[PDB]
Structures are given as structure tokens and as C-alpha cells.
Design a protein around this ligand. Structure first.
Ligand SMILES: NC(=O)c1ccc[n+]([C@@H]2O[C@H](COP(=O)([O-])OP(=O)(O)OC[C@H]3O[C@@H](n4cnc5c(N)ncnc54)[C@H](O)[C@@H]3O)[C@@H](O)[C@H]2O)c1
Ligand SMILES: NC(=O)c1ccc[n+]([C@@H]2O[C@H](COP(=O)([O-])OP(=O)(O)OC[C@H]3O[C@@H](n4cnc5c(N)ncnc54)[C@H](O)[C@@H]3O)[C@@H](O)[C@H]2O)c1
Ligand SMILES: [Cl-]
Ligand SMILES: [Zn+2]
Ligand SMILES: [Zn+2]
Ligand SMILES: [Zn+2]
Ligand SMILES: [Zn+2]
Lengths: 374, 374
């Protein structure tokens, strides 16, 4: 069996930036106390993973990426009370340690045991658990789901419904709950409002889907990629516009189109020009601009503070404001109850081994979410 | 009767920037329809006035400044349904025109009729009601209270309580409502939270009072002027901090002092560095930072969007988010119902003819609020 023994499996390792992943044999150490070893069943490719490949989000290399996933618990360490082997689970990229300031504060979810802020590349106890060619391989956001087995801290893992379709539900681990919560919990979109959503990746489209579930009267979807429009529209966008069609700055276009700005604007791309245009496009006295895309390392925005004095709210959030371990369970329950559908987001299913082809699909505007099967 | 004819009186006219005010004889035209001519009983000197003298807030010159005030209604023009001659009045620097998007929206207050954003120095119909030496003099924020008589549009004037100390209550026209409102209505300070306030002028200490009124467990008051601390402590600040006493940046000191950051920070000064230190000292995952001070003409902050992505909110607000015409009276009522005391703030009362003396007191930290009487 495997419980308590090292596991040897395939995993896609990123040895260098801007280089392909290498499906390698790696040894995965057993769970220490309060840790869980999971067997990956399905994983989604998310833009945050692509940012590490591209050089925009620095994390310690070599690394096993991946964080949007669903799997079955193979073994649990001592102390682990929340998980039992055989339990279906979604690994959370933001832990909910339950004992820090942020975790106790009912409205905050960026727990202090996270590894996004200043990435160590390890698990919470400071150590790694993957070895490939004798060398230690670093973890990513403490989840590293781009491997057939991974070890995750207990506070970073959620037990979900035993009947959950893991090849659909893995989206709720990052992309969907991020997009949808951005609208429903972060910006708190109001019925009848006008919302703009910049970027239509699987997180951008769940933001559209969150604005529609909130009662937004209008949802303008912005993207330089026309092919995304049909899905946006099907999911709730009232209109879709492409910045390259206009001769004047996209915030001016939208201000003119909405009687001086939207009420709620969402940036789900991660570029500075669109984070600025997304601030600008919202109404000067009643707009909320929510930052969802992750910015390129060390870059800055020069804003005039007056943009804010008149009444604008600029905020950002991680995971759609969901406290990870309590939220992702309930959102799967909702999923089961048929409250929403993830099917339009999943455009491709590839075997794990075809991971690089999955990143090529993202890079070409051909895929919204690619799911990788183990 | 004064009515229907051009009044000639005294007004402190600013002819050039960084120049002493000239107390001069000007002609205040009669009210057109939907306008009101008011006799100034008391005027507070507020930081926004000073910025026009400094050159920090550009506005068409010559101009008669002033916007913090209480007076009695001399004549009302035609169609004026809300105030009658003799009615006690506080002119509002931000109108509540009742009909625009911002006015119909229950949460916003920067009515579109405002003359703050792109100041044209006239009343809402695009014309001035003041003359001096065969020259039209401009208005400031459609209020121009540094004149014995001023004409203001109707939507920009509130009928306050018939029995109100007009020498006290005029602070509610700007400073008290802005500072207090910023805390209670914009930041929405929570019971038991910890707030930091940068700048302890008239607006600043009213923010200290608002946080205390909101139930903040800790209120740290920051000011390079050590003499304001006694008042701050008296008004609610649990601690006072002078940036010059340190060797490390004030955010670092405050982050350290407050377990990672303050829950609510208010910048009530208007400098870029303090807007920055104000963003930085509130907790990255749950702090709200509120901009209240007014920024120098065309100066930008280079910020890193990761500062918001972790979860902190950044918002500005005009008038402490009070709908003006509806708000200032309810507060005058609260003052009248013994809810708070403006006394600590009214530091000096001078005859209006000493207005340049009043600005010198401000320019030396002697004064918190100087009231100019008529
Ligand atoms: N805040 C978080 O919690 C959180 C969570 C998950 C993902 N993210 C971030 O969300 C962002 C996107 O996520 P995704 O997985 O949905 O990625 P994605 O690649 O599928 O979506 C990006 C979309 O933006 C569009 N786009 C690119 N340039 C554009 C431009 N100049 N103008 C308009 N649109 C443009 C692209 O066509 C693409 O459709 C990434 O930056 C990711 O890092 C953040
Ligand atoms: N948003 C609005 O609705 C609104 C309304 C009223 C006033 N304001 C703005 O509020 C700001 C000030 O209000 P005020 O009327 O009380 O003026 P004020 O001059 O009396 O008070 C400003 C305080 O800032 C302190 N200070 C100065 N430099 C400092 C520094 N470098 N670091 C820390 N503290 C410093 C000064 O000692 C003073 O105590 C002004 O910028 C005014 O324009 C805005
Ligand atoms: Cl004129
Ligand atoms: Zn993600
Ligand atoms: Zn925590
Ligand atoms: Zn209005
Ligand atoms: Zn003022």
C-alpha cells in the first residue's frame, strides 16, 4: 500500500522560467502531523500558474505548480481530524488556519499562513516534500497539485461532498470561487447595477456569472479576444466590447456608454493599463473597482489621489473573499443543488501528461479552463 | 428693504495667489430664481481655503473664498420652497441637487452640480453675483462665505435649527461633518476596531470624535504638531504619535504598534506621503484607508497593486459622505439634542476684518478652528 511510505509518481516540474514543464518522476514524502497526502484526480490550469512560468510572479524555482484541484485523500498525518482517507477534497490555495487575526475577523480571508505574499516555496512548517533527481522541489502556494500526489497542510484542504464530480468541481478550488465571490462578496454587486468585467478567462467569466447572480442590470465584458464573447454573453454579459475596435481610451468609451461610469468594475487579467482603465471606468462618486488579477512583480501604478476623493472605492481580494475551508464546501453543495454550472468554463480536458499543450491552449485564446485528468 | 437691490458690503477678496486677502467693498447681486442671499453670522477657516491661498487648489481668481458657515436668510429668489427670509441657514460646499444619478443613488453624495471637481467659480447657472471695481469676482464652491452677504443656489443651503448657536454650529457646514462623517459613514468604523488619524486640524479631530462615537477600541492620532495632542486625547484618541520622534517610517511604527496594522486609517492633511503612510499602516487584509485631505494640484502616488489585492480597501469621500441638504440639519439637530460639543475645536474667534490674522494662526499651529464673526 502507500500509507506512510514515500510515493514515486509523475509531476510536472518547472526547472526554469519561460521553459516547458517536465513530467518527471518525483518522490513525495508521507504526511507529517496535520498534513494530508492527496491523489490528484483533476486540475485546472489557472493564470496565476502561467504567471510563474512567464516570470511575472516570482516563486522559488524548481517548483511544482498547480492549485486549482480536486482529489481523494490517500493518507493523513497525526492530528488530522477533518480528513479521513477516501474523502474527496479540494486543496485550498489560501489556508484558513482558524487562529490568526485575519481568520478570526469575520470579513477577512487572506490568512497569515499563506504563501502568496512572500513565497517560501514550502509547506507551513518550513519544509518541502518533493524530491526529483535527489534535489528538493519547492511547493507552490502550499498545494502543488500539478503532480499525481501532493501533501498539503490540513488547514489548506477542504472535504467536499462524496458525490462531487471531481472533474467539474476542481474549478471551485480557485477560478470559479474567485470570480464569483469577487462580485457576490467582495464588490457586493447590487441588483440593478451596471458592472464592467475586464478579462474573460475562467475567472473573468465567473465574475460575469457572479454579477448576474447578484441582479446586475448590465454587465459589459471587455476582452481583446473576440472568441470569448459568445461564452460571456451566454453566461450573463449584456454586451461585450473589444478595446481594439475603438479609437479612444476604453475608460472613456465605457463612461460615455454608462452615464459616466459603471457602478462595479472588475479587473481579472493582471495588467497595469487595465487596472488603471478599470479604476477610471467606474463612476467617480459611486463606483467600486475591484482588483482580482495578480500584478506583474514590482510594477507600479501612478494614480492621482483625486480619483478617490470624489467617492471611489478601490479594493482587491484573494479567493473571492471566501474563507477557504468553510466556503469551498458550501459552494460545492450549491453546485450539487444545481445553483450554477461549471460546464461552460471547461472547454478542454487533457490527460496530465499533456500539461504543456494545455498552457499552449491558454496562450492562444482557445481555452477558457483546460482540465487535466490523472 | 435690502431685497431686489444690489447690496454693497465687505468681502475678503483674494486677488492673487500667496497674497494677503483684501477686505473690500463688493456688490452682491440679488438672488435669481432658486437662489438665496444670506447674511453671514459666522465663518470657520478650513484647510481647503488655505489651499487656494497656497496655490494647491487651482480655482478661477479673483475669488471670495469661504465655505464653512452659518447665516440668516436675507432674501430668497423665485421658486424657493425650502427656506424663508429669517430662516437660519448653513450653506453646503457640495450641493444635493436632489435629481442627478449621485443624488438618486442612496449611497453616494458628490452631487454633479458640485464645483469642486472642475471648479468654474460661478453658481450653478454659470454666472457670478459679485462685483468689485468694475470687475466680476468669482465664487468658491458656490458658497463664497468670506463676505457679509453671499448668494448661494437653493440645493446648496440647509435650513438648520431656528435656535442654533451660529458661532458654533457653523463647523457642521464643513470640518465637523467631513471628519466625523468620514469615520461613521465612509470608513464605517466597527466597535472595538483600531483606527489611526493623520492630521489633527478641525477635520482631523472630528474624525477622532467619529471613531470614538463609532466605538473604536483604539484611536492613534498622528501629527507633527505636538500641541494638538491634548485636544485629541480629550476628544477620544487613545495615543498620539509624532512622526519626528522616530527613526523608522511611521507605517512601520504603526504596523508594529497594532499587530500588523490598523483596522481603519484616515489621512486628514492632504500630503502625498501621508496618503501613502496612511494606506500602508492599515492591515493588508482587512484595513480600510480613507482619504479625507485634499491632494496638491496634479501630484500622483506610485502604488503597488499588491497592496490592495491582499484585501485592503482604499476610498475617498467628500463631506463625510453625508447627503448635504438632508445631512447637515440632522446633525444640527443632534448638536441641539446635546450629542457632541464643537467647543474644543473652536480655538479662536475673531472679527471678520482680521481674516489674514486667522490664516496666520492656522499657519502656526495655534489654531485648530478660528471662527470669524460678523
Ligand atoms: N485574486 C485572486 O485570488 C486570483 C485568483 C485566481 C486568479 N487570479 C488572477 O486572475 C487573472 C486571470 O485569471 P484567469 O485564470 O481567468 O486567466 P486567463 O488567462 O484565462 O484570462 C485572461 C484574459 O484576459 C484577456 N486579456 C488579456 N489582455 C487583455 C487586454 N489587454 N485587455 C482586455 N483583456 C485582456 C485575455 O484574452 C484572457 O481572455 C490572472 O491574473 C490570475 O493571476 C487571481
Ligand atoms: N474631503 C473633504 O470633504 C474635505 C472636507 C474638509 C476638508 N478637507 C481637507 O482636509 C484637510 C485638512 O483639514 P483641516 O481643515 O482640519 O486643516 P488643518 O490645517 O487645520 O489641519 C491639518 C493638520 O495636518 C498636520 N500635518 C501637517 N503636516 C503633517 C505631516 N507632514 N504629517 C502629519 N501631520 C501633518 C498639521 O499640523 C495640522 O494639524 C485639508 O487638506 C482639507 O483640504 C477635505
Ligand atoms: Cl457674469
Ligand atoms: Zn488560481
Ligand atoms: Zn489564519
Ligand atoms: Zn445631485
Ligand atoms: Zn472645508
Amino acid at each position: 500500500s502507500t500509507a506512510g511510505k514515500v510515493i514515486k509518481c509523475k509531476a510536472a516540474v518547472l526547472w526554469e522560467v519561460k521553459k516547458p514543464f517536465s513530467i518527471e518522476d518525483v518522490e513525495v514524502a508521507p504526511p507529517k502531523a496535520y498534513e494530508v497526502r492527496i491523489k490528484m484526480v483533476a486540475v485546472g490550469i489557472c493564470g496565476t500558474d502561467d504567471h510563474v512560468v512567464s516570470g511575472n510572479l516570482v516563486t522559488p524555482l524548481p517548483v511544482i505548480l498547480g492549485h486549482e484541484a480536486a482529489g481523494i485523500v490517500e493518507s493523513v498525518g497525526e492530528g488530522v481530524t477533518t480528513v479521513k482517507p477516501g474523502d474527496k477534497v479540494i486543496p485550498l490555495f489560501t489556508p484558513q488556519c482558524g487562529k490568526c487575526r485575519v481568520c478570526k475577523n469575520p470579513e477577512s480571508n487572506y490568512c497569515l499562513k499563506n504563501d502568496l505574499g512572500n513565497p517560501r516555496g514550502t509547506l507551513q512548517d518550513g519544509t518541502r516534500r518533493f524530491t526529483c533527481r535527489g534535489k528538493p522541489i519547492h511547493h507552490f502556494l502550499g498545494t502543488s497539485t500539478f503532480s499525481q500526489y501532493t501533501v498539503v497542510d490540513e488547514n489548506a484542504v477542504a472535504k467536499i461532498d462524496a458525490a462531487s464530480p471531481l472533474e467539474k468541481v476542481c474549478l471551485i478550488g480557485c477560478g470559479f470561487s474567485t470570480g464569483y465571490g469577487s462580485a457576490v462578496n467582495v464588490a457586493k454587486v447590487t441588483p440593478g447595477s451596471t458592472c464592467a468585467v475586464f478579462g474573460l478567462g475562467g475567472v473573468g467569466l465567473s465574475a460575469v456569472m457572479g454579477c448576474k447572480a447578484a441582479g446586475a442590470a448590465r454587465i459589459i465584458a471587455v476582452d481583446i479576444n473576440k472568441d470569448k464573447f459568445a461564452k460571456a454573453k451566454e453566461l450573463g454579459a449584456t454586451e461585450c466590447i473589444n478595446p481594439q475596435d475603438y479609437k479612444k481610451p476604453i475608460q472613456e468609451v465605457l463612461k460615455e456608454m454608462t452615464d459616466g461610469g459603471v457602478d462595479f468594475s472588475f479587473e481579472v487579467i493582471g495588467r497595469l493599463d487595465t487596472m488603471m482603465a478599470s479604476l477610471l471606468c467606474c463612476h467617480e462618486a459611486c463606483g467600486t473597482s475591484v482588483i482580482v488579477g495578480v500584478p506583474p512583480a514590482s510594477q507600479n501604478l501612478s494614480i492621482n489621489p483625486m480619483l478617490l476623493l470624489t467617492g471611489r472605492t478601490w479594493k482587491g481580494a484573494v479567493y473571492g473573499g471566501f474563507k477557504s475551508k468553510e466556503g469551498i464546501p458550501k459552494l460545492v453543495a450549491d453546485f450539487m443543488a444545481k445553483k450554477f454550472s461549471l460546464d461552460a468554463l471547461i472547454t478542454h480536458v487533457l490527460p496530465f501528461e499533456k500539461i504543456n499543450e494545455g498552457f499552449d491552449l491558454l496562450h492562444s485564446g482557445k481555452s477558457i479552463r483546460t482540465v487535466l485528468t490523472f
